A = this chain, B = another copy of it.
Amino acid sequence: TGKALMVLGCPESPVQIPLAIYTSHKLKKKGFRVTVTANPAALRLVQVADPEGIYTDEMVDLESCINELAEGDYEFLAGFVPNDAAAAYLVTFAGILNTETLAIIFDRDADVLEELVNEIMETLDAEIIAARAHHNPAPLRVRIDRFMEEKP
């Protein structure tokens, strides 16, 4: 019950936006109202992929969200992390929210994933899902389903 914030990274990989929507839909089926925060193209991709706004509840540009966010605004935080820039934003958002946090890391290079995994472990108190994926969402979708079966 409550509100959830979902942070997206720059969209390069085809699996991101689709998985962002899938994860949001999963959260909504648990009672959460979810807010998506991302750069301009990423938010646009979400808007056209879900033209009627059925899988999402609200959207806000990264900097604007950073400017208005305060502790207690959300009980759940989910961040997609395809790179350094995305990791740093999730860390920032996490420091402000101080709530249940989830990092979803992905890239096709195991080394890059390892670097991203290390970074999140050393900085945040957060559950991690990490998979080598670029075009096939399966690995991540299954692991997200699993996470969702238990953790709110």
Binding site for B on A (CB under 8 A): 10-19, 21-22, 25, 40-41, 44-46, 48-52, 54-55, 135-138, 141
Contact = CB atoms under 8 A, between A and B. Distances in A.
A45 B18 CA distance: 6
A42 to B, nearest CB: 8
Counting every copy of the chain, the complex holds: 2
A146 to B, nearest CB: 15
Contact of A44 (B11, B16, B51, B136): B136
A135 B41 contact: yes
B135 A12 contact: yes
B41 A19 contact: no
A22 B47 CA distance: 9
